[PDB]
From Swiss-Prot, chains C, D, E, F:
Pfam entry (one): Ferritin
Superkingdom assignment: Eukaryota
Organism: Mus musculus (Mouse)
The protein's assembly and partners: Oligomer of 24 subunits. There are two types of subunits: L (light) chain and H (heavy) chain. The major chain can be light or heavy, depending on the species and tissue type. The functional molecule forms a roughly spherical shell with a diameter of 12 nm and contains a central cavity into which the insoluble mineral iron core is deposited. Interacts with NCOA4; NCOA4 promotes targeting of the iron-binding ferritin complex to autolysosomes following starvation or iron depletion.
Protein's job: Stores iron in a soluble, non-toxic, readily available form. Important for iron homeostasis. Has ferroxidase activity. Iron is taken up in the ferrous form and deposited as ferric hydroxides after oxidation. Also plays a role in delivery of iron to cells. Mediates iron uptake in capsule cells of the developing kidney. Degraded to release iron upon autophagy activation by nutrient starvation.
Annotated residues for binding of Fe cation 1: 24, 59, 62
Domain Ferritin-like diiron: 7-156
Ligand binding (Fe cation 2): 59, 104, 138
Lineage, opening ranks: Eukaryota, Metazoa, Chordata, Craniata, Vertebrata
Compartments where located: Cytoplasm; Cytoplasmic vesicle, Autophagosome; Autolysosome
Family: Belongs to the ferritin family.
InterPro entries assigned: Ferritin (IPR001519), Ferritin-like (IPR012347), Ferritin-like_diiron (IPR009040), Ferritin-like_SF (IPR009078), Ferritin_CS (IPR014034), Ferritin_DPS_dom (IPR008331)
EC number: 1.16.3.1
Listed name of the protein: Ferritin heavy chain
Gene Ontology CC annotations of this record: autolysosome; autophagosome; cytosol; endocytic vesicle lumen; extracellular region; membrane; mitochondrion
Length: 174, 174, 173, 173, 173, 173
């Protein structure tokens, strides 16, 4: 029954990876939705849109690499429905960022829970893969997003209407 | 209520674009499921995997550009769940290509129905948009996929074991 | 009468093209007025002026390309007076953009009436010309003007006096 | 039973594409016959010859592209005899340009009957293919040929003996 | 009350700069009309068309630079209707060239009137501006067009049919 | 009434050259049919199609070069219908090549009967032309086609399904 390549790869880890695949695809979709909001003619912050589109494509890459890992270890990929995001209207540049921060923290939780699952099953390869490709990336993104929320807040966003405009230019422009 | 940019853009065209968006996201996911399959150690056809990963990324491109068009015309993007594919085991390179042909024919059907809806609402811009970016690329993909299916069959795939291996090298490795 | 090249080209299409030539030239003049206004020493927004000057030249190119199409199909160009813009004083950066938007949507509406006329006379060449060179340019222009209007509004133009200044630098510069 | 790739492609469109193909090939032969005539030691207008040679090759490309389309849509090509042109002797530069103008108007009318067929069958891919590669190319060509005929006439062709010689140098060379 | 930058700029010079602007724009439109006539399939003189298109764009540049001067000096631009040219059919290359000469002379006379006015108001900046960018450009244009008229005439235009054809290649190519 | 350049050019040679022109154009059409066939979605051998398309264009060039020779020698070109190929469906890679081989040998036979005719009429220039440009080209084409047919057969074409596919890649790719 098991793959000829399979070794030290617990069925709980396999299952966890397929959930994590789902989650990265979800995040990709969330970011795509945010991107689309900022491209609207009545929002119209082009570098906010471009920033989220770029983040959407990075999340897809995160999902594809986890698919590759699955196949490497001789697990089997089981896709599920990718759920629409919880809203269509993201309200403002500040709120989009706070929602991305929250998302990224959720995804980091899931990943830290995976690493623990890997640790308890004594799977150092999987521990290393997660550490090497996902954990510092997340930490870096969380810090970035926090830095963005902080600046947009101190600037008076979203009520002070120059704020999101100038941030779009100077921080995301780049 | 309506967007400041909105002109000659019927609510049914809007709704139809949002459905087409979902369908293109669906297609992308079908193609990624196939890519994952060919990457399995017990399938191990690397250019079939690369070919479908590439189709998957193209379909995501198709979705994104339909979202750009939606914003351009002043419609509002309403995302839905992306449904998983109808299976995770694609059986063989021949079968994957026949399913791909089928898929592309389904997507062309929807595009042609969208074009008809645009024509009946006298939306020449939407007609042109669909013509210019979608209909020709569909006819081209449908013809390519049919050529692939024909070759794999004439070659004796999948029962003749060298067929999928060589096709992988000569047709999909170029 | 008829031209040796004239095929499947209805005289109502021939008249409607001459009206569209006039409208494109009219839009060129409106844009030129706007550019002049932003070059005023008491208005003094250089990138707004440059922006409208560029749009004014694009409209002249649209007019010239309809003239070439008319001659191509064996129609005859008949020119009319280009009317002056409805005002001299465009009042602010926001206001000018919003008048530009209104202007582009009036042109777009005319071009869609043109396409409809060409559809009903079964002139697929004229339908394709219009789609290929006018309709998607219009849609893109309308989206851009719409974007610009929104940012200016969101910024507090015109009453927050730094709004048009910075828009002039970061978006039009 | 139908091709595995066939979708939304009516049997009458398939038939009409096969007739267009033959027409394109016929026109190529007509242009080649003209090239042959101008290369005669008793006519000897090298650039007329080269012009009609280039037109012949273009028309063959048109034919090939329609066959590509037939196969893309899952149609089946059925070739027919390419009829010889209606004469061997084309008389003059002017007369050959006039006959070329009549030929391209006849092929255009057949493309327009094809596009009205495509439209009637709700085949937007075929309609766009025809617009994109055939209809604008036909109008350009008819306009060019009309321009040539008009200059040759104004020049005094063929009775003023210098007219086709100089045209051949200045316009066609 | 007047612009912060206004100094030594009389109200009549300001009005008279607004009439000149309109004159330059009319002349642009006149040259465009002439361009369109030479692009007709029944006239078909491509270089005569290019030439007058080029003159059209120059005249518009002349209008634009006059709008610039107006703002530089603190005057206000007041645009008027641009009147259609006095005809649509320009008859021949010779006659278009003859009418182009009469047009450039009428514009020159208006510039000379404008300079007299600048002189009488002791506006040396305006006089210099007119001499530098307009007066010697006009004289060169008027000499060029006279030269074109003279050749066309000596060549037998428009009755000698080869005349406008060969002028079009040798002088205007 | 003979051409001013005609010398030592018999009217049977003149008629025979007109027949070879028709035969070369026929060969061009045959090979184009074949190309269209391999481009079918249910045949789908791209390098086969590519191969026969290049052959079709080479045959058109052979036809055009005989047309030039005819004019060179003072003969007059008389064009005939180009008959359609004897079928539409070329059944397989192997079969098409065997048909091309038979085709090339029929054209070579015609070219040898032509040479014989120019020999019997003592037309050493026509003999030389035929040899220099036709005869060794046919010999090489015939050899190449025979090589292809032999490899396809040895390979198990068309019953072994991989044969034409692999041949398409390695020999024609
Ligand atoms: Fe700033
Ligand atoms: Mg991630
Ligand atoms: Mg560790
Ligand atoms: Mg798609
Ligand atoms: Mg249409
Ligand atoms: Mg326009
Ligand atoms: Mg053609
Ligand atoms: Mg089109
Ligand atoms: Mg001037
Ligand atoms: Mg001076
Ligand atoms: Mg040959």
């Amino acid at each position: 029954s098991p793959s000829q390549v399979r070794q030290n790869y617990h069925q709980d880890a396999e299952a966890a990876i397929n959930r994590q695949i789902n989650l990265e695809l979800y995040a990709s979709y969330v970011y795509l939705s945010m991107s689309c909001y900022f491209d609207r003619d009545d929002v119209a912050l082009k570098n906010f849109a471009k920033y989220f589109l770029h983040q959407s494509h990075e999340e897809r890459e995160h999902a594809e690499k986890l698919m590759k890992l699955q196949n490497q270890r001789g697990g089997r990929i089981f896709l599920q429905d990718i759920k629409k995001p919880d809203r269509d209207d993201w309200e403002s540049g500040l709120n989009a960022m706070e929602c991305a921060l929250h998302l990224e923290k959720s995804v980091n939780q899931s990943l830290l829970e995976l690493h623990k699952l890997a640790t308890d099953k004594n799977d150092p390869h999987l521990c290393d893969f997660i550490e090497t490709y996902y954990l510092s990336e997340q930490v870096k993104s969380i810090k970035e997003l926090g830095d963005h929320v902080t600046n947009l807040r101190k600037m008076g966003a979203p009520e002070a209407g120059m704020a999101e405009y100038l941030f779009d230019k100077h921080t995301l422009g780049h």
